[PDB]
Amino acid sequence: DRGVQMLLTTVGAFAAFSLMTIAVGTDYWLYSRGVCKTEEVMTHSGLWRTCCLEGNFKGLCKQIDHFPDTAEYFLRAVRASSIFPILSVILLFMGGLCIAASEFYKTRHNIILSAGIFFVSAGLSNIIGIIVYISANAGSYSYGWSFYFGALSFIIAEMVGVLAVHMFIDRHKQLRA
Amino acid sequence: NERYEGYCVDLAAEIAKHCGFKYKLTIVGDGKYGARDADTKIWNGMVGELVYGKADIAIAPLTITLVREEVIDFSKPFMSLGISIMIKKPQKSKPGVFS
Amino acid sequence: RKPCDTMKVGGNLDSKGYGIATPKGSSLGTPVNLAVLKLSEQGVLDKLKNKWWYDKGECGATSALSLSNVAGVFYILVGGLGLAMLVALIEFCYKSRAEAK
Amino acid sequence: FLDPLAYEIWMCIVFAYIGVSVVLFLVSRFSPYEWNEFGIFNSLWFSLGAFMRQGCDISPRSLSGRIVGGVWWFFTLIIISSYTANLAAFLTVERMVSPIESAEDLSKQTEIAYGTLDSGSTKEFFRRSKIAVFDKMWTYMRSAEPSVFVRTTAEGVARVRKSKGKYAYLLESTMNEYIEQRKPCDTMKVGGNLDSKGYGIATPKGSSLGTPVNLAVLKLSEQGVLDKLK
Amino acid sequence: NEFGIFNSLWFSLGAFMRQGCDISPRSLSGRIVGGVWWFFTLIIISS
Amino acid sequence: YTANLAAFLTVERMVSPIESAEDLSKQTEIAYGTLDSGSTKEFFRRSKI
Ligand SMILES: O=c1[nH]c2cc(C(F)(F)F)c(N3CCOCC3)cc2n(CP(=O)(O)O)c1=O
Ligand SMILES: CCCCCCCC/C=C\CCCCCCCC(=O)OC[C@H](O)CO
Ligand SMILES: CCCCCCCC/C=C\CCCCCCCC(=O)OC[C@H](O)CO
Ligand SMILES: CCCCCCCCCCCCCCCC(=O)O
Ligand SMILES: CCCCCCCCCCCCCCCC(=O)O
């Protein structure tokens, strides 16, 4: 059907954007046995802040130091600056803008295709971000709800991109018909 | 006394407290532990400071050997040890991006 | 001690000890012997060992295939997806321009 | 059967699968100038079958669809080859891992029980210890049901041999080393000594035998008699 | 061209020997069955 | 490619590090030595094992 699809894509875009922004913001990416401030105790290693839990001084949070081959340096850079998660957030925002501007300027249907391309690119950036995150960590533990919020953002972004392209195809089908 | 710190410093402090007597830590001048020169039969190092009354007690990491147990009295060992192997750390190798 | 690049691997080969020396006929010998045994029983010696070897220490204390082993293939995959998207869009722009304006 | 690859590889395989399917669909269907049997459902099926090294039934004909297909094929080849190779390595050399290798390890986890003899220096060492790890061990054992305490060393070894890996017995190093080397060799000794103690030769309150036996023991130790005898 | 009993058997056999298909299911149910059997085959042959 | 990868992973899986002393006696890749002159040197020299 039609009419529902625009609302569903808008809702999905908002959900993906919110999830990814929260995930980049929060710090429950990794539960590891690190050190809170500078013994061992469980932590809240996020993208930026490793923070202490279930200890004498739980709730103390410190900025992660991402440094003490050229590949190692470049990976450390790319992971220190969460460029790929941030780029994911920005692309999701631009896709949201494209969907919003669809209601106006409806005549031109290449603005909704842009929305689709932005959402799919957001998904790809999210994948690269997860891969660099995990790889940098690798050079007992667990993943917290922030990581899975990032993952769910990826899934929803890819679904919303599919829907955007689907409705672009329908619009050009109507126009040619 | 306050100028120094270490395992032996704390051990000496506790021993004194148990026995109840002041003390003055003094390093060995020569810088050796103990050895009987075959010719002279001289004891250098803290074993010297013990045999020739120059000191009253040694609280250093002094091995309990036979050549040494003869001329002085050793307390029951306060730290057991031995020879051991030391190697470089494993240094787990990061796989290449295109490995 | 830093840089923390070494490791003790094998248990001890031989067995010796360290002791508190005293002059051959000094009255301190018996009391110091009993003091050492009392400390050893009370765990003070173990605590001092911990304090001076570990508390002042400058350091802390699978077989599956890890993502690090196959990371490059993921990078290549996503790079190829991006390139594919770019090529598609370039062709689409070219076709849009191609129609007789 | 998932053990050859880490959980992260499986997760990223699923992500890459969805990404590839979506990009193949987009790149094949979006252009109005194309209007490809490559809807979203057919794109997902293509990707799945490419991964499982099964047939195609359709292959992208455009440049862009072919780029996507090619990289996904390369990915699949490497990942499946790597799975097979690592499983071979697993099944060739079996590497059993000791669950605990230290005292602090026994303290930190709780899956495996452990306890000392009913009464002895082994018990007291924990009953009256101020050390973090031994304090924690005492806290656990003081209340452990069923009683982690045995009536005899024979009972202790029998109990550790009965339990698969649930129970760990704390005893003197020398007896532990003796037991380990005997049949059926069902048990091993892990980690270092928790404390230090010595065995010696006694002697009456005062005698002339003590002074020379001390020299004898030191001479034996230094010569290497005691190590060789042990 | 469609999955009768004999063609179903042939499809399954060929999927097990990794010997490609002349026909593959087109429906959601057929594709679920096919996909799961492909997974099974991949694990068992690798093993 | 698959067979050589398997060889790589199998070999890397059967690599045992050093665990004892006699393990130093058996191999020759890892050199080992003691202090120039001291108790450990003598212990080895007069060693009857
Ligand atoms: O009684 C003795 N006690 C010793 C105690 C120690 C230490 F462990 F450091 F406390 C050392 N260290 C070994 C490394 O070089 C010097 C420092 C040497 C000692 N030596 C000399 P040895 O002849 O080499 O044994 C003795 O004689
Ligand atoms: C006609 C249709 C065309 C389809 C086209 C898609 C097929 C792509 C396939 C494989 C790409 C593999 C890329 C290999 C990149 C490896 C480069 C590399 O890393 O080499 C340097 C090395 O790291 C130094 O140590
Ligand atoms: C387009 C329609 C295609 C239809 C779909 C075809 C089926 C897909 C193939 C395989 C499924 C494999 C399922 C894997 C199940 C994993 C179970 C698991 O992970 O449990 C282990 C546990 O996590 C450890 O503690
Ligand atoms: C196409 C198939 C989809 C895959 C289905 C996956 C079902 C199992 C997922 C298990 C997740 C376990 C969570 C791990 C916990 C952690 O260490 O973070
Ligand atoms: C073509 C893409 C699908 C391929 C099939 C992949 C399904 C496996 C996913 C399982 C999730 C990971 C859980 C297992 C790891 C673990 O818990 O040890």
SS3 for chain C is: CCCCCEEECCCCCCCEEEEEEEECCCCCHHHHHHHHHHHHHHCHHHHHHHHHHHHCCCCCCCCCECCCCCHHHHHHHHHHHHHHHHHHHHHHHHHHHHCCC
Q: Which residues are CB-contacts of E7 (< 8 A; sequence separation ≥ 6)? A: E23
Q: Which chains touch E (3 or more CB pairs under 8 A)?
A: D
Fold observed for domain A4-176: Butyryl-CoA Dehydrogenase, subunit A; domain 3 (1.20.140)
Please work out, in degrees rounded to the nearest 5, the angle formed at the alpha carbon of residue A14 by the alpha carbons of A8 and A20: 130
Could you tell me the maximum CA-CA distance found in chain B, to the nearest angstrom?
A: 71
A15-29 b/e with 16+ CB inside 10 Å = b? bbbebbbebbebbbb
Residue C24 sits at φ, ψ, to 5 deg, of -55, -30
Of C76, C77, C81, best ligand 2 pocket probe by most atoms within 8 Å of the beta carbon: C76
* Total Cβ atoms within 10 A of residue F2: 15
Q: Is the CB of B61 under 6 A from ligand 1?
A: yes
Two tokens at C4?
């923390």
Please give the C-alpha separations between residue C73 and each of A117, C84, D90, D214, in angstroms, as whole numbers.
23, 16, 23, 69
CA distance B93 to B91: 6
In chain A, residues 48-87 whose CB comes closer than 8 Å to chain C: none
Find the C67 Cα to ligand 2 centroid distance in Å. 19
Kindly list the domain boundaries of chain A, sorted by start residue: 4-176
- Measure the CA–CA gap between A37 and A34, rounded to whole angstroms: 10
Tokens of D44: 């997902």
Resolution as reported, in Å: 3.2
Q: For testing the chain F interface, which of D92, D97, D101, D222 should be mutated: the one with the most F CBs within 10 Å?
A: D92
The residues facing A49 across adjacent strands are A63
Contact B87 F40 (CB under 8 A): no
How do beta strands A30-34 and A141-143 pair?
A: antiparallel
Under a CB-based contact definition with an 8 Å cutoff, are residues D141 and D116 in contact?
A: yes
Question: What would the 3-class secondary structure string for D189-222 be?
Answer: CCCCCCCCCCCCCCCCCCCCCHHHHHHHHHHHHH
Task: Please report residues of A whose CB lies closer than 8 A to that of C74.
Answer: 127, 131
Please name the method used to determine this structure.
cryo-EM
| Strand duo B35-36 + A41-42: pairing | unpaired
Eight-state DSSP code of residue D5:
B
Question: Ligand 4 pocket test: which of A30, A31, A140, A142 has the largest number of ligand atoms within 8 Å of its C-beta?
Answer: A142
Residues in D lying within 8 Å of E, measured between beta carbons: 1, 45, 48-49, 52-55, 57, 80, 83-84, 87
Binding residues of D for L-glutamate, as ranges, are 121-122, 172
B95 is in an annotated binding site: no
Rounded to whole angstroms, how far apart are CA atoms B79 and C45? 8
For chain A, list the strands marked E by DSSP: 30-34, 41-42, 49-51, 61-63, 141-143
Residues of C in contact with F9 (CB under 8 A): 65
Instruction: Check pocket membership of D17 for ligand 5, CB cut-off 6 A.
Output: yes
Q: What burial class does residue A158 get, using C-beta atoms within 10 Å of its C-beta: 0-12 exposed, 13-18 middle, 19+ buried? A: buried
Q: Distances in Å between the alpha carbon of C14 and those of A158, D8, D105, F39, F42? A: 66, 46, 27, 12, 12
Which of A118, E2, A89, B20 is CA-nearest to residue C89?
Answer: A118
For chain C, the farthest-separated pair of C-alpha atoms sits apart, in whole angstroms, at 117
Residue of B nearest to F21 (CA): B85
Pairing of strands D113-115, D167-169: parallel
Specify the ligand 4 atom closest to the Cα of D17: 1
Which residues in chain D have Cβ-Cβ distances shorter than 8 Å to F13? Answer: 89-90, 92-93, 95
> What is the SS3 assignment for A41?
strand
- Chain position carrying tokens 């090619």: D70
Q: Which two structure tokens, joined as six digits, stand for A52?
A: 């202490």
Pairing of strands B58-63, B72-74: unpaired
Distances (CA, A) of B88 to B85, C7, D24, F11: 10, 6, 50, 21
Assess whether the C-beta atom of D61 lies below 6 angstroms from ligand 2.
Answer: no
Instruction: Measure in Å the smallest separation between the Cα of F41 and chain B Cα atoms.
Output: 10
User: Distances from the Cα of C82 to the Cαs of A155, D18, D65, F42, in angstroms?
Assistant: 18, 14, 12, 69
